[PDB]
Scaffold this active site. Sequence first.
Site, PDB file in Angstrom:
ATOM      1  N   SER A 295       0.800  -1.222   0.000  1.00 13.01           N
ATOM      2  CA  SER A 295       0.000   0.000   0.000  1.00 13.01           C
ATOM      3  C   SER A 295       0.834   1.273   0.000  1.00 13.01           C
ATOM      4  O   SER A 295       0.260   2.363  -0.110  1.00 13.01           O
ATOM      5  CB  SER A 295      -0.936   0.010   1.208  1.00 13.01           C
ATOM      6  OG  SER A 295      -1.629  -1.215   1.333  1.00 13.01           O
TER       7      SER A 295
ATOM      8  N   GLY B 253       3.755   9.297   6.640  1.00 15.27           N
ATOM      9  CA  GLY B 253       4.110   8.032   6.025  1.00 15.27           C
ATOM     10  C   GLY B 253       2.885   7.218   5.662  1.00 15.27           C
ATOM     11  O   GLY B 253       1.768   7.733   5.618  1.00 15.27           O
TER      12      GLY B 253
ATOM     13  N   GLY C 121       2.213  -0.703   4.426  1.00  9.24           N
ATOM     14  CA  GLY C 121       2.089  -1.592   3.285  1.00  9.24           C
ATOM     15  C   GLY C 121       1.865  -3.019   3.734  1.00  9.24           C
ATOM     16  O   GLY C 121       2.308  -3.432   4.807  1.00  9.24           O
TER      17      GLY C 121
END
Lengths: 456, 455
Positions: free
Chosen positions: A69, A299, A302
């Site tokens: 991601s 940030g 993922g």
Amino acid sequence: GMVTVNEVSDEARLRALVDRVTGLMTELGVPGVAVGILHGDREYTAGFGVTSLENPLPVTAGTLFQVGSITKTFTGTALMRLVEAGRIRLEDPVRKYLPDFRVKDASVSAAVTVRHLLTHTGGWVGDYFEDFGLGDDALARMVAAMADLPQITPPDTVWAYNNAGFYVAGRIVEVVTGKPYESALRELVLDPLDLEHAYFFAHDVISYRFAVGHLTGEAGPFVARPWALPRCANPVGGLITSVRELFKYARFHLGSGPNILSAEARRLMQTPAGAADAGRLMGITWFIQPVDGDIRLVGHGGGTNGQITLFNFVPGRNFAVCVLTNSDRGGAINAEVTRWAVESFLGAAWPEPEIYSLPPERLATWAGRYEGVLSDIELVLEGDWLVLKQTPKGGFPRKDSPPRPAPPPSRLGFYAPDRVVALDLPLKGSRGEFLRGPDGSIAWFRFGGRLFRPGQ
Amino acid sequence: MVTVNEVSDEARLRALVDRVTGLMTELGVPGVAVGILHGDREYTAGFGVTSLENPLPVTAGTLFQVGSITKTFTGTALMRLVEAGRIRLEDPVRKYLPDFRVKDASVSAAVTVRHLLTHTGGWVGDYFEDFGLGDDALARMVAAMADLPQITPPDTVWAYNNAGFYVAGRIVEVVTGKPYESALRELVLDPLDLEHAYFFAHDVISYRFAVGHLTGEAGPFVARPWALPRCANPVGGLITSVRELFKYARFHLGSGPNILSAEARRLMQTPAGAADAGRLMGITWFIQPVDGDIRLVGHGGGTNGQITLFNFVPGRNFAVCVLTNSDRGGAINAEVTRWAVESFLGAAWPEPEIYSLPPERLATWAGRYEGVLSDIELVLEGDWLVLKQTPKGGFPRKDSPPRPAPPPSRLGFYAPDRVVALDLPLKGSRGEFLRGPDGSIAWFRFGGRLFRPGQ
């Protein structure tokens, strides 16, 4: 079979890191972990473990991981690229560029803008994964398949992590550019930023050092198959890169890189456009997490089929930290490495919220079934604690793929009204929120960014 | 010092491991995989590493790019559609591909499926480009063939024809209504129980695989790109291991399930004419006579730094498999196959006898010879003719850089107008000078491909 410590750039400085990570991996069973830390002119890399359990190779700083991601930020950066050139505006409706686009709600299909997709404020069912081949038509067929996507909440009401919203975001890039997303992302972001080893297909990563995903069940970890995501999910989380290239990506977003986006546009991606989940703020694709006064982590996380990653950076401080694991339990490592680097290189104090439980009479009002689209959440009163029991429904990565091994249960501890966090590995650290309806009853249980409907 | 990884029978293969461990350090191949099937006994042997940048022990299950061996799989699918009464080899191509066309108008109307499977099309055989990773890649390639000119008329001069299998593969696509990679699973792969037989990098990536190795000036290096275009899958895009090629071998020996009739596999193994260098051409099969009734029936494979070889002897339940991950592995493909034939069957390999030619006679063959994928120069050196190959690029992709030219090799005659290279890595490749009716040299056939005399 203990873990290995393959490469450490600075041994004395990262000594606490070397021992802190080398411990966790033995605990969770993570086969490999790659770490990269940035502080001004200095770069600190560290590699642990093996790339694959069946086909072991030392994980290095150049090892290719599926960042998952994290690719959403690349899609957003590519879209902001097109916004600066005067070709796209964030407030423009989606139908301005894809007039055929539609979801189940017609009123939402005509009012959703580009800003809604990048801030996860669309409201439709997010976790929707199909396969439409490996041709350039795969992404165009993904968007057309979204015509049956039902609405969970109206837009701009309750924040919801939206994977499906980035099918459209990537498809918009396809239409305005006139090229496949992978080529357009390579044209506007990868090539100008010298992202050498940044790939989307397995036919570009085989000849190098790469990592495979791992799922852990009862008897331990095992290789996760299939390894490749559907081609239509590449704008959502199909990027494959390493630590050494994520450093180059960090330098750009810190203002210390080349100008494919002006600084003004880059700070706009890092300006809070609204609230996200669990006390986090939503930028343009970027997650913003307040920490210590002006110190705030920007940030994104993922996670693919067995590869969990994390990327963070502090603006105005020239700081960044990348953690890439190859296990479905590496998220616990992702958090401790990110926390230590901030506390070690920036000297910050972390907001550790106080953990507390409630009298079991109250805890019984939160227990029950919570239905999601990818999994179920099971809260049961056990002792003086509420325990979370997750059960994947199946459907990832492919619509036919099996239910992944469920994680061990974890106790839930309150740190604020209607806000909890898991206290036991491997779920330890994940925050949750009980969003209540207008009558005071529990309307949703937001956990990991996803909304779960109370079934009871 | 090359690590020996696996040996099914150390005693029976005692001499084998010694010959390969020495031949690898000589030529510089990182890993080979050997499989021998004789009756009900199977002999496997793992060797070396899968990569130079990322070594891993090569086993019998290590996935290799079998290369142009896939042509035999494509013919098996078409022969399966033959038996079902769906297609006929004698039928023209346009019966199934009404829009099919090459540059020549008459050839487009007369070429049959048998022409594709026997390398008798006459059009340019080596023609490669990319049309994406989608299921449409094979359709756009066959349509792009409308400009392929004719080297020779059909059924005149035999020449290796990769392009014909674009069409032979596309015929499977249209007849079944499935993608070529899917149609192969439905027809032969799944019926024969071969899971680890893939076509894409995204299915091999999770298993043990071998990367290709090119030998340059500074030594061998990992070959990039690893991938072949999707449209070239009917040509040579199959990726499998030794463990699966046994079941494929066992099938064509008759000791497998009958998706093809017995006489069908025999008709596939029957020579439909002469190919190149004394070899015979069956249905996609290459037949090489060796001794008496024993015949090597099989095919070679060549990708970007991976040379393979698969041969079987009908009537003996015999088959050999040699998969190497370097461009200099051909000498090991021949050596292991040569040793296995007379070690398990006890024959005598046809080692051709060489004779010398005066320099005044050799000068009639020397000169420049132009090809499509490479150039050939014949030079007089001492009492020998020297071959010098100069690749021009275009493989694996039309824009790929030219590969390092192989070391020159002396040429020795074993028959009138027939040569064979004597130095590695070209040692073993025979050539032929085809003379026109006026007596002049019309073509130089080397490596199954034709070369026009320089003007």
